[PDB]
Coordinates of C-alpha atoms and ligand atoms in Angstrom, one line a residue:
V1 CA 21.0 11.5 8.9
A2 CA 22.6 14.4 6.9
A3 CA 20.4 17.3 5.6
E4 CA 21.4 16.2 2.1
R5 CA 19.6 12.9 2.5
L6 CA 16.3 14.9 2.8
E7 CA 16.5 16.5 -0.6
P8 CA 13.5 15.3 -2.7
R9 CA 14.7 13.0 -5.4
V10 CA 11.9 13.4 -7.8
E11 CA 10.4 16.5 -9.5
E12 CA 7.2 17.3 -11.4
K13 CA 7.9 17.6 -15.2
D14 CA 5.0 18.1 -17.6
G15 CA 2.4 16.7 -15.3
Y16 CA 4.4 13.6 -14.3
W17 CA 6.9 12.9 -11.5
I18 CA 10.4 11.8 -12.6
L19 CA 13.7 11.1 -10.9
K20 CA 16.0 14.1 -10.9
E21 CA 19.1 13.5 -13.1
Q22 CA 21.5 13.5 -10.1
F23 CA 19.6 10.6 -8.4
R24 CA 19.6 8.2 -11.4
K25 CA 22.9 6.5 -10.6
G26 CA 22.6 2.9 -9.3
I27 CA 18.9 2.5 -9.8
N28 CA 17.2 -0.9 -10.4
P29 CA 16.0 -2.0 -13.9
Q30 CA 12.3 -1.0 -13.2
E31 CA 13.4 2.6 -12.3
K32 CA 15.1 2.7 -15.7
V33 CA 11.8 1.5 -17.3
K34 CA 9.9 4.4 -15.7
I35 CA 12.4 7.0 -16.9
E36 CA 12.5 5.6 -20.4
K37 CA 8.7 6.2 -20.6
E38 CA 6.2 7.3 -17.9
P39 CA 3.7 4.4 -17.5
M40 CA 0.7 6.7 -16.8
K41 CA 1.0 8.0 -20.4
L42 CA -0.6 4.7 -21.6
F43 CA -3.8 5.8 -19.9
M44 CA -3.6 9.6 -19.5
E45 CA -2.4 10.2 -23.1
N46 CA -4.2 7.2 -24.5
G47 CA -1.0 5.4 -25.6
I48 CA -2.9 2.1 -25.1
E49 CA -4.9 2.8 -28.2
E50 CA -2.0 2.4 -30.6
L51 CA -0.2 -0.2 -28.5
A52 CA -3.2 -2.5 -28.6
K53 CA -3.0 -2.6 -32.4
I54 CA 0.5 -4.2 -32.5
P55 CA 0.7 -8.0 -32.6
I56 CA 2.3 -9.4 -29.5
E57 CA 5.0 -11.1 -31.5
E58 CA 5.9 -7.7 -32.8
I59 CA 5.7 -6.1 -29.4
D60 CA 8.2 -8.6 -28.1
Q61 CA 10.8 -7.5 -30.7
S62 CA 11.5 -4.1 -29.1
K63 CA 12.5 -3.3 -25.5
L64 CA 10.2 -0.3 -25.3
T65 CA 7.0 -2.1 -26.2
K66 CA 7.9 -5.3 -24.4
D67 CA 8.4 -3.2 -21.3
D68 CA 5.0 -1.5 -22.1
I69 CA 3.2 -4.9 -21.8
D70 CA 5.3 -6.5 -19.1
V71 CA 5.7 -3.5 -16.8
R72 CA 4.0 -0.3 -17.7
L73 CA 0.6 -1.9 -18.3
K74 CA 0.4 -2.7 -14.5
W75 CA -0.3 1.1 -14.1
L76 CA -3.6 0.3 -16.0
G77 CA -4.1 -2.9 -13.9
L78 CA -3.0 -5.3 -16.6
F79 CA -0.7 -8.2 -15.9
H80 CA 0.8 -10.1 -18.8
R81 CA 0.9 -13.8 -17.9
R82 CA 4.0 -14.3 -20.1
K83 CA 5.2 -17.7 -18.8
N84 CA 2.0 -19.5 -18.0
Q85 CA -0.7 -17.9 -20.3
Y86 CA 1.3 -16.1 -23.0
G87 CA -0.4 -13.2 -24.7
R88 CA -3.2 -13.0 -22.1
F89 CA -3.6 -10.5 -19.3
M90 CA -5.0 -10.7 -15.8
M91 CA -6.8 -7.4 -15.0
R92 CA -7.0 -6.1 -11.4
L93 CA -9.4 -3.4 -10.2
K94 CA -9.5 -0.7 -7.5
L95 CA -12.4 -1.8 -5.3
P96 CA -12.2 0.2 -2.1
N97 CA -13.6 -1.7 0.9
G98 CA -14.4 -4.7 -1.4
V99 CA -17.8 -3.3 -2.5
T100 CA -19.2 -4.2 -5.9
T101 CA -22.6 -4.1 -7.6
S102 CA -24.6 -6.7 -9.5
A103 CA -24.2 -4.6 -12.6
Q104 CA -20.4 -4.5 -12.2
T105 CA -20.4 -8.2 -11.5
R106 CA -22.4 -9.0 -14.7
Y107 CA -20.0 -6.8 -16.7
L108 CA -16.9 -8.6 -15.4
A109 CA -18.6 -11.9 -16.1
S110 CA -19.4 -10.9 -19.7
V111 CA -15.7 -10.0 -20.3
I112 CA -14.4 -13.4 -19.0
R113 CA -17.1 -15.3 -20.7
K114 CA -15.8 -14.2 -24.1
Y115 CA -12.5 -15.9 -23.4
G116 CA -13.9 -19.4 -22.7
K117 CA -11.3 -21.8 -21.2
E118 CA -8.8 -18.9 -20.9
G119 CA -11.2 -16.9 -18.7
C120 CA -12.3 -17.0 -15.0
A121 CA -12.2 -14.6 -12.1
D122 CA -10.8 -14.5 -8.6
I123 CA -11.4 -12.7 -5.3
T124 CA -8.0 -11.5 -3.9
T125 CA -6.5 -11.2 -0.4
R126 CA -7.1 -7.4 -0.7
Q127 CA -10.9 -8.0 -1.1
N128 CA -10.6 -7.2 -4.8
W129 CA -11.6 -8.6 -8.2
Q130 CA -9.2 -10.0 -10.8
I131 CA -10.4 -11.2 -14.2
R132 CA -8.4 -13.4 -16.6
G133 CA -8.1 -14.1 -20.4
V134 CA -7.9 -10.5 -21.6
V135 CA -6.3 -10.0 -25.0
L136 CA -4.5 -6.7 -25.7
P137 CA -6.7 -5.7 -28.7
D138 CA -9.8 -5.8 -26.4
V139 CA -8.2 -3.5 -23.7
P140 CA -9.5 -0.1 -25.0
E141 CA -13.1 -1.4 -25.1
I142 CA -12.7 -3.0 -21.7
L143 CA -11.4 0.3 -20.2
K144 CA -14.5 2.0 -21.6
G145 CA -16.8 -0.7 -20.2
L146 CA -15.4 -0.5 -16.8
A147 CA -15.8 3.2 -16.7
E148 CA -19.4 2.8 -17.9
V149 CA -20.3 0.6 -14.8
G150 CA -18.3 2.8 -12.4
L151 CA -15.1 0.8 -12.1
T152 CA -11.4 1.7 -12.5
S153 CA -8.4 -0.6 -12.9
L154 CA -5.9 2.2 -12.4
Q155 CA -2.6 1.9 -10.5
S156 CA -3.4 -1.5 -9.1
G157 CA 0.0 -3.1 -9.7
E158 CA 3.7 -2.4 -9.6
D159 CA 4.9 0.8 -7.9
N160 CA 1.5 2.1 -6.9
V161 CA -0.9 2.3 -4.0
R162 CA -2.8 -1.0 -3.8
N163 CA -6.5 -1.6 -3.1
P164 CA -7.7 0.3 0.0
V165 CA -9.0 -2.4 2.4
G166 CA -11.8 -1.7 4.9
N167 CA -14.3 -3.4 7.2
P168 CA -16.4 -5.9 5.2
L169 CA -19.2 -5.2 7.6
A170 CA -19.0 -1.5 7.1
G171 CA -22.4 0.3 7.6
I172 CA -24.2 -3.0 8.5
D173 CA -22.6 -4.2 11.7
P174 CA -24.2 -3.5 15.0
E175 CA -20.7 -3.6 16.5
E176 CA -18.7 -1.4 14.1
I177 CA -16.6 1.4 15.4
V178 CA -16.8 3.6 12.3
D179 CA -18.1 3.0 8.7
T180 CA -14.9 2.6 6.7
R181 CA -16.5 3.1 3.3
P182 CA -16.3 7.0 3.1
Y183 CA -12.6 6.8 3.9
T184 CA -11.6 3.9 1.6
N185 CA -13.7 5.6 -1.1
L186 CA -11.8 8.9 -0.6
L187 CA -8.5 7.1 -0.6
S188 CA -9.3 5.3 -3.9
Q189 CA -10.5 8.6 -5.5
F190 CA -7.3 10.4 -4.3
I191 CA -5.0 7.6 -5.5
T192 CA -6.6 7.3 -9.0
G193 CA -7.4 11.1 -9.4
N194 CA -11.1 10.3 -9.6
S195 CA -10.4 7.5 -12.2
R196 CA -8.4 9.9 -14.5
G197 CA -5.0 8.9 -13.0
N198 CA -2.9 10.6 -10.3
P199 CA 0.8 10.9 -11.4
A200 CA 1.7 12.5 -8.0
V201 CA 1.5 9.1 -6.4
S202 CA 2.2 6.7 -9.4
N203 CA 6.0 6.9 -9.2
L204 CA 6.7 5.3 -5.9
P205 CA 9.9 3.3 -5.1
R206 CA 7.7 0.2 -4.6
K207 CA 4.1 -1.0 -4.0
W208 CA 2.3 0.4 -0.9
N209 CA -0.7 -1.1 0.9
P210 CA -3.3 1.0 2.8
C211 CA -6.2 0.0 5.1
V212 CA -8.8 1.8 7.3
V213 CA -9.9 0.0 10.4
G214 CA -13.6 0.1 11.5
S215 CA -14.0 -3.3 13.3
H216 CA -12.9 -4.5 16.7
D217 CA -12.2 -7.8 14.9
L218 CA -9.5 -6.0 12.8
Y219 CA -10.8 -7.7 9.7
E220 CA -8.6 -5.1 7.8
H221 CA -5.2 -6.6 9.0
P222 CA -3.7 -3.2 10.0
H223 CA -0.6 -4.9 11.3
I224 CA 0.6 -5.8 7.7
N225 CA -0.2 -2.5 5.9
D226 CA 2.1 0.3 4.9
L227 CA -0.5 2.7 6.3
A228 CA -3.2 1.6 8.7
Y229 CA -5.8 4.1 10.2
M230 CA -6.7 3.0 13.7
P231 CA -9.9 4.7 14.9
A232 CA -9.2 6.8 18.1
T233 CA -10.5 9.8 19.9
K234 CA -8.1 12.5 20.9
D235 CA -9.1 15.4 23.2
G236 CA -12.7 14.8 22.5
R237 CA -12.4 14.5 18.7
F238 CA -12.9 11.5 16.4
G239 CA -9.9 10.5 14.2
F240 CA -7.2 7.9 13.6
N241 CA -3.9 6.9 15.1
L242 CA -1.5 5.9 12.3
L243 CA 0.5 2.7 11.9
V244 CA 3.2 2.6 9.2
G245 CA 5.5 0.3 7.3
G246 CA 3.9 -3.2 7.7
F247 CA 4.9 -5.4 4.8
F248 CA 5.7 -9.0 3.6
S249 CA 8.4 -10.0 1.1
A250 CA 10.6 -13.0 0.3
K251 CA 13.5 -11.3 2.3
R252 CA 11.7 -9.8 5.3
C253 CA 8.3 -9.5 6.9
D254 CA 7.6 -6.7 9.4
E255 CA 4.5 -5.5 11.3
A256 CA 3.5 -1.9 11.1
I257 CA 4.8 0.4 13.8
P258 CA 3.2 3.6 15.4
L259 CA 4.1 6.8 13.5
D260 CA 3.1 8.4 16.9
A261 CA 0.6 10.5 14.9
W262 CA -3.2 11.1 15.2
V263 CA -5.2 12.9 12.6
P264 CA -8.8 14.1 12.7
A265 CA -11.1 12.1 10.4
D266 CA -11.1 14.9 7.9
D267 CA -7.3 14.6 7.5
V268 CA -7.4 11.0 6.1
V269 CA -6.5 12.1 2.6
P270 CA -4.1 14.9 3.5
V271 CA -2.0 12.5 5.7
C272 CA -2.1 9.7 3.0
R273 CA -0.7 12.3 0.6
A274 CA 2.0 13.5 3.0
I275 CA 3.2 10.0 3.7
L276 CA 3.2 9.0 0.0
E277 CA 5.0 12.3 -0.9
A278 CA 7.7 11.5 1.8
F279 CA 8.1 7.9 0.4
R280 CA 8.1 9.1 -3.2
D281 CA 10.6 12.0 -2.5
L282 CA 13.0 10.1 -0.3
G283 CA 12.8 6.3 -0.8
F284 CA 15.8 4.2 -1.9
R285 CA 15.5 3.1 -5.5
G286 CA 18.2 0.4 -5.7
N287 CA 17.9 -3.3 -4.9
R288 CA 14.1 -4.0 -5.3
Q289 CA 14.2 -6.1 -2.0
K290 CA 15.1 -2.9 -0.1
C291 CA 12.5 -0.5 -1.6
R292 CA 9.4 -1.0 0.6
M293 CA 8.6 2.0 2.8
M294 CA 9.8 0.3 6.1
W295 CA 13.3 0.5 4.7
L296 CA 13.1 4.3 4.6
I297 CA 11.7 4.4 8.1
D298 CA 14.6 2.2 9.3
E299 CA 17.1 4.6 7.5
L300 CA 15.7 7.9 8.9
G301 CA 14.3 6.4 12.1
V302 CA 10.6 6.7 12.9
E303 CA 11.1 10.3 14.2
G304 CA 13.1 11.3 11.2
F305 CA 10.4 9.9 8.9
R306 CA 7.6 11.5 11.0
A307 CA 9.2 14.9 10.6
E308 CA 9.1 14.4 6.8
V309 CA 5.4 13.6 6.9
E310 CA 4.8 16.6 9.2
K311 CA 6.5 19.1 6.8
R312 CA 4.1 17.8 4.0
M313 CA 0.9 18.4 6.0
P314 CA -1.2 21.5 5.5
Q315 CA 0.0 24.1 7.9
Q316 CA 2.8 21.6 8.7
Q317 CA 1.0 20.2 11.7
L318 CA 0.8 16.6 12.8
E319 CA -0.5 15.8 16.3
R320 CA 1.0 13.0 18.4
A321 CA -0.9 9.7 18.8
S322 CA -3.7 9.4 21.2
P323 CA -2.8 7.2 24.2
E324 CA -5.7 4.9 23.5
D325 CA -7.7 3.9 20.5
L326 CA -11.3 2.7 20.1
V327 CA -10.4 -0.9 19.2
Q328 CA -11.3 -3.2 22.1
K329 CA -8.5 -5.6 23.0
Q330 CA -11.1 -7.9 24.6
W331 CA -12.5 -9.3 21.4
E332 CA -13.2 -12.7 19.6
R333 CA -13.0 -12.4 15.8
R334 CA -16.5 -13.0 14.5
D335 CA -17.5 -15.5 11.9
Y336 CA -19.2 -13.6 9.0
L337 CA -20.2 -16.7 7.0
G338 CA -23.9 -17.6 7.4
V339 CA -26.9 -15.4 8.1
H340 CA -26.5 -12.4 10.5
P341 CA -28.8 -9.5 11.5
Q342 CA -27.8 -6.0 10.4
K343 CA -28.0 -2.9 12.6
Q344 CA -30.9 -1.9 10.3
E345 CA -33.9 -3.6 11.9
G346 CA -35.6 -6.3 9.7
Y347 CA -32.4 -6.8 7.6
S348 CA -29.8 -9.5 7.5
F349 CA -26.5 -10.1 5.6
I350 CA -25.3 -13.5 4.4
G351 CA -21.7 -14.5 4.1
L352 CA -21.1 -17.1 1.4
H353 CA -18.0 -19.3 1.1
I354 CA -16.3 -19.1 -2.3
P355 CA -13.9 -22.1 -2.5
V356 CA -10.4 -20.6 -2.9
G357 CA -11.9 -17.4 -4.3
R358 CA -12.4 -18.9 -7.8
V359 CA -15.5 -18.2 -9.9
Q360 CA -16.6 -18.7 -13.5
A361 CA -18.7 -16.3 -15.6
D362 CA -21.9 -18.4 -14.9
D363 CA -21.2 -18.3 -11.1
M364 CA -20.7 -14.5 -11.2
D365 CA -24.1 -14.0 -12.9
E366 CA -25.8 -16.3 -10.3
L367 CA -24.3 -14.3 -7.4
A368 CA -25.4 -11.0 -9.1
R369 CA -28.9 -12.5 -9.5
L370 CA -29.0 -13.3 -5.7
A371 CA -27.9 -9.8 -4.8
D372 CA -30.7 -8.4 -7.0
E373 CA -33.4 -10.8 -5.9
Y374 CA -32.6 -10.9 -2.2
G375 CA -30.4 -7.9 -1.4
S376 CA -29.9 -4.4 -2.8
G377 CA -27.8 -5.3 -5.8
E378 CA -24.6 -5.1 -3.7
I379 CA -21.9 -7.8 -3.3
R380 CA -19.0 -7.4 -0.9
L381 CA -15.7 -9.2 -1.2
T382 CA -13.6 -10.3 1.8
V383 CA -9.8 -10.8 2.3
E384 CA -10.5 -14.5 2.9
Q385 CA -11.7 -14.5 -0.7
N386 CA -15.3 -14.9 0.3
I387 CA -18.5 -12.8 -0.3
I388 CA -21.1 -11.1 1.7
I389 CA -24.5 -10.1 0.3
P390 CA -25.9 -7.4 2.5
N391 CA -29.3 -5.7 2.9
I392 CA -31.6 -8.8 2.7
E393 CA -35.0 -8.5 4.3
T394 CA -34.9 -11.2 7.0
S395 CA -38.2 -12.6 5.8
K396 CA -36.5 -13.7 2.6
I397 CA -33.8 -15.8 4.3
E398 CA -35.9 -19.0 4.3
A399 CA -36.3 -18.9 0.5
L400 CA -32.6 -17.8 0.0
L401 CA -31.3 -20.8 1.9
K402 CA -33.1 -23.1 -0.6
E403 CA -31.3 -21.6 -3.6
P404 CA -29.4 -24.3 -5.5
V405 CA -26.2 -22.2 -5.9
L406 CA -25.8 -22.1 -2.1
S407 CA -24.8 -25.8 -2.3
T408 CA -21.7 -24.7 -4.1
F409 CA -21.2 -21.3 -2.4
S410 CA -22.3 -22.3 1.0
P411 CA -23.3 -20.1 4.0
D412 CA -22.1 -23.0 6.3
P413 CA -19.2 -24.9 4.8
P414 CA -17.0 -27.2 7.0
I415 CA -15.0 -25.2 9.5
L416 CA -11.6 -25.6 7.7
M417 CA -13.0 -24.3 4.5
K418 CA -14.3 -21.1 6.3
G419 CA -10.7 -20.2 7.0
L420 CA -8.9 -21.5 3.9
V421 CA -7.0 -18.8 1.8
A422 CA -5.0 -19.6 -1.3
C423 CA -3.1 -17.4 -3.9
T424 CA -3.3 -17.7 -7.7
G425 CA -0.4 -20.3 -7.9
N426 CA 1.1 -21.8 -11.0
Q427 CA -2.1 -22.2 -13.0
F428 CA -1.5 -18.5 -14.0
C429 CA 1.3 -16.9 -12.0
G430 CA 4.8 -17.1 -13.5
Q431 CA 6.5 -16.7 -10.1
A432 CA 4.6 -19.7 -8.6
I433 CA 6.7 -22.7 -7.6
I434 CA 3.6 -25.0 -7.1
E435 CA -0.1 -25.3 -7.9
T436 CA -2.1 -23.9 -5.0
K437 CA -5.8 -23.5 -5.5
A438 CA -6.8 -27.0 -6.6
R439 CA -4.3 -28.7 -4.3
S440 CA -5.3 -26.7 -1.2
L441 CA -9.0 -27.7 -1.8
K442 CA -8.1 -31.3 -2.2
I443 CA -5.9 -31.5 0.9
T444 CA -8.3 -29.5 3.1
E445 CA -11.2 -31.9 2.0
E446 CA -9.1 -35.0 2.9
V447 CA -8.0 -33.5 6.2
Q448 CA -11.6 -32.6 7.2
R449 CA -12.8 -36.1 6.3
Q450 CA -10.4 -37.4 9.0
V451 CA -10.9 -34.9 11.9
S452 CA -13.6 -32.7 13.4
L453 CA -12.9 -29.5 15.3
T454 CA -14.5 -26.5 16.9
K455 CA -11.6 -24.0 16.7
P456 CA -11.7 -21.9 13.5
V457 CA -8.2 -22.8 12.3
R458 CA -7.0 -20.6 9.4
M459 CA -5.0 -22.2 6.7
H460 CA -3.2 -20.2 4.0
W461 CA -1.5 -21.5 0.9
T462 CA 1.0 -19.4 -1.1
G463 CA 2.8 -20.5 -4.2
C464 CA 6.2 -18.8 -3.7
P465 CA 8.0 -16.6 -1.1
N466 CA 6.2 -13.4 -2.3
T467 CA 3.5 -14.6 0.2
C468 CA 0.5 -13.0 -1.4
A469 CA -1.6 -15.4 0.6
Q470 CA 0.0 -14.1 3.8
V471 CA 1.2 -17.4 5.2
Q472 CA 2.8 -15.5 8.1
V473 CA -0.7 -14.7 9.4
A474 CA -2.0 -18.3 9.3
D475 CA -2.6 -20.8 12.1
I476 CA -1.1 -23.3 9.5
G477 CA 0.7 -21.8 6.5
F478 CA 2.0 -23.6 3.4
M479 CA 4.6 -21.9 1.2
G480 CA 5.3 -23.5 -2.2
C481 CA 8.7 -25.2 -2.8
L482 CA 10.2 -28.0 -4.9
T483 CA 11.4 -31.0 -2.8
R484 CA 12.3 -34.6 -3.2
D485 CA 10.4 -37.9 -2.7
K486 CA 11.8 -41.1 -1.1
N487 CA 13.4 -41.9 -4.5
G488 CA 15.0 -38.5 -5.0
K489 CA 12.4 -37.5 -7.7
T490 CA 11.4 -33.8 -7.9
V491 CA 8.0 -33.2 -6.4
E492 CA 6.0 -30.2 -5.4
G493 CA 6.2 -29.4 -1.7
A494 CA 5.4 -26.9 1.0
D495 CA 7.3 -25.2 3.8
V496 CA 4.9 -25.4 6.7
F497 CA 4.5 -22.3 8.9
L498 CA 3.0 -22.0 12.4
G499 CA 2.4 -19.2 14.9
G500 CA 0.5 -16.6 13.0
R501 CA -2.2 -14.6 14.9
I502 CA -4.6 -12.0 13.7
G503 CA -6.7 -9.4 15.5
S504 CA -5.4 -7.1 18.3
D505 CA -2.9 -9.7 19.6
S506 CA -1.3 -10.2 16.2
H507 CA 1.9 -12.2 15.6
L508 CA 3.9 -13.3 12.6
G509 CA 4.2 -17.1 12.1
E510 CA 7.5 -18.7 11.1
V511 CA 8.7 -21.9 9.3
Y512 CA 8.1 -25.0 11.4
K513 CA 9.0 -27.7 8.9
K514 CA 10.7 -27.3 5.5
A515 CA 10.2 -29.1 2.2
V516 CA 7.3 -31.4 2.9
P517 CA 6.1 -33.2 -0.3
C518 CA 2.6 -32.0 -1.0
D519 CA 1.6 -35.7 -1.2
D520 CA 2.6 -36.1 2.5
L521 CA 0.8 -33.1 3.9
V522 CA -2.5 -34.7 4.9
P523 CA -1.1 -36.9 7.8
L524 CA 1.1 -34.0 9.0
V525 CA -1.8 -31.6 9.1
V526 CA -4.2 -34.1 10.6
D527 CA -1.7 -34.6 13.4
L528 CA -1.0 -30.9 13.9
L529 CA -4.7 -30.2 14.2
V530 CA -5.2 -33.0 16.8
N531 CA -2.1 -32.1 18.7
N532 CA -2.3 -28.3 18.7
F533 CA -5.8 -27.2 17.8
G534 CA -8.1 -29.6 19.7
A535 CA -9.2 -31.6 16.7
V536 CA -10.7 -35.1 17.2
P537 CA -10.3 -38.1 14.9
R538 CA -13.6 -39.1 13.3
Ligands
SRM1 C1 -4.0 -11.9 -6.5 C2 -3.1 -11.7 -5.3 C3 -3.1 -13.1 -4.4 C4 -4.4 -13.7 -4.4 O1 -4.7 -14.8 -4.9 O2 -5.3 -13.1 -3.7 C5 -1.6 -11.4 -5.7 C6 -1.0 -11.9 -6.8 C7 0.2 -11.6 -7.3 N1 1.1 -10.8 -6.6 FE1 0.9 -10.2 -4.7 N2 -1.1 -10.7 -4.7 C8 -2.0 -10.3 -3.8 C9 -1.7 -9.7 -2.6 C10 -0.5 -9.7 -2.0 C11 -0.2 -9.4 -0.6 C12 -1.2 -9.5 0.5 C13 -1.7 -8.2 1.0 O3 -1.7 -7.2 0.3 O4 -2.2 -8.1 2.2 C14 1.3 -9.4 -0.5 C15 2.0 -9.5 0.8 C16 1.8 -8.2 1.6 C17 2.7 -7.1 1.1 O5 2.8 -6.8 -0.1 O6 3.4 -6.4 1.9 C18 1.7 -9.6 -1.9 C19 3.1 -9.7 -2.2 C20 3.6 -9.6 -3.4 C21 5.0 -9.4 -3.7 C22 6.2 -9.3 -2.8 C23 6.2 -7.8 -2.4 C24 7.6 -7.4 -1.9 O7 7.8 -6.3 -1.3 O8 8.6 -8.1 -2.2 C25 5.1 -9.5 -5.2 C26 6.3 -9.3 -6.1 C27 6.6 -7.8 -6.2 O9 5.8 -6.9 -6.2 O10 7.8 -7.5 -6.5 C28 3.7 -9.8 -5.7 C29 3.4 -9.9 -7.0 C30 2.2 -10.5 -7.5 C31 1.8 -10.8 -8.9 C32 1.3 -9.5 -9.5 C33 3.0 -11.4 -9.6 C34 3.0 -11.5 -11.1 O11 2.7 -10.5 -11.8 O12 2.8 -12.5 -11.7 C35 0.7 -11.8 -8.7 C36 -0.3 -12.0 -9.9 C37 -0.7 -13.4 -10.0 C38 -2.0 -13.6 -10.7 O13 -2.1 -13.8 -11.9 O14 -3.0 -13.5 -10.0 N3 2.9 -9.9 -4.6 N4 0.7 -9.7 -2.7 C39 -3.4 -10.5 -4.4 C40 -4.0 -9.4 -5.1 C41 -4.3 -8.2 -4.1 C42 -4.9 -7.1 -4.8 O15 -6.1 -7.2 -5.1 O16 -4.3 -6.0 -5.0
SF4_2 S1 2.6 -15.8 -3.7 FE1 3.9 -16.2 -5.5 S2 2.7 -17.8 -6.7 FE2 1.2 -16.8 -5.3 S3 0.2 -15.2 -6.6 FE3 2.0 -14.3 -5.3 S4 3.7 -14.2 -6.8 FE4 2.2 -15.7 -7.6
CL3 CL1 2.9 -6.1 -9.6
CL4 CL1 4.9 -14.3 -16.1
K5 K1 -12.6 -18.4 0.2

């Protein structure tokens, strides 16, 4: 790699970071959008106030404003559902470590309630909230309301650092390695500039996913993050070994690889900054399918990339990885659904199943009520799109288990439901090839009617090759496609994946059978479970 390849391609200009003139040749259409107008201006210079006043039909008549709503608004966490819910916006938060409060939950509920049939909310595969139904004129007020309850929606989509994932049992688990909340909080604050916006990290070549590990279970999926902090002692000091470049895409899925770097715990933010600066400064900005950070690491080599991180550290020092980390390879992933004792004597947490992560306003209020009456007003989200309510005096559990809402959001659903994960799909998502959420529930119900099992088989449904529901990590994965029935009629189908493993012995699954009509999946899955996962016909 030439010395010329290492010239930073972006520069700071009037508080924002923009591509230098000599590096603008051959860039993708989105890079052109960012040059035409800095997206962060919609928030940091309050451009949203005037934009929100223009009728959507008028907005669509000019490239600048259409790009504002379809692209730049993702820097404010707003996602125009152009194809499938025209004129309405999904809104996505920053929610480090998946931690929410009852007050925040009620606020989100009140927003979606306004929108009636156009409104609902979802827990995401990054343990985050999305709300739906938002109309542009309401955005300024919603931004204020979020701030009032201690939430931000900043930099949650497009070419930004995504939600910092942590241990859902952080601070409450007798078996945790390190409480991940301080670190994920620091990361979120750094990324969003304490909810004011951070332009230093908002002009990346592509999305970028971070996680901090604190569990032997590896609930945080470090193997599929752009940056994963693996807890490790080095020379008697506590810190993190660093894995880099994990990602999924339609074209390519890759697990994270060692940077061969360890940082002390206090350097979590400095090294995040250094890595992001290296990616921002040096990443390819052509074909969007070749813009994820792993492509830069392949181009420079891991050592070449490492040197670029090193030069961006304070005092330009970056220690080599510690030979061992603190994560025990001998470990069975623990079920968190149901009632479990906390490390705080006399307290329990309860994991509740949220069917396919979907909730209505009334449901959110009920969950917020439970958290107040039984817990400490805290609700935690998980990457399987479930919830945990921590800090419940164990003496209250008997009463809790009799609560009517627990028949819907159960602490002990059937085993296949415990492991079921599904993306948005075509109810709202314009990229979706099939409907996912309703279908996956229906199929899973029918399958479980036919077989019993003891192995916690994990089934993931994703609506298109973007694989937001991570089918490559599943025991059985379903990727949306269109296919043909016996008569040659177009029907929704799934490509079926097998081989995904999570935890320390991770592995990426692959397509096993293409183009199965969704209507034919039940018998296929029943047989797979009996033949490969020890299931027994009922
Ligand atoms: C909501 C969520 C799935 C879910 O039901 O939980 C989701 C939903 C969408 N993803 Fe995703 N992704 C979600 C996690 C994922 C993950 C999983 C993860 O982070 O562990 C991946 C695969 C891992 C990865 O990125 O490396 C993922 C891979 C993508 C991709 C393909 C990325 C690529 O490099 O090609 C796209 C398309 C893109 O960005 O170009 C995408 C784009 C989209 C969009 C924004 C597409 C669009 O605007 O319509 C989806 C919004 C649909 C909607 O209305 O909800 N989504 N997306 C997840 C929100 C996470 C969050 O809170 O931030
Ligand atoms: S996997 Fe495809 S269909 Fe599902 S939310 Fe992601 S982009 Fe939409
Ligand atoms: Cl996006
Ligand atoms: Cl769309
Ligand atoms: K769920």
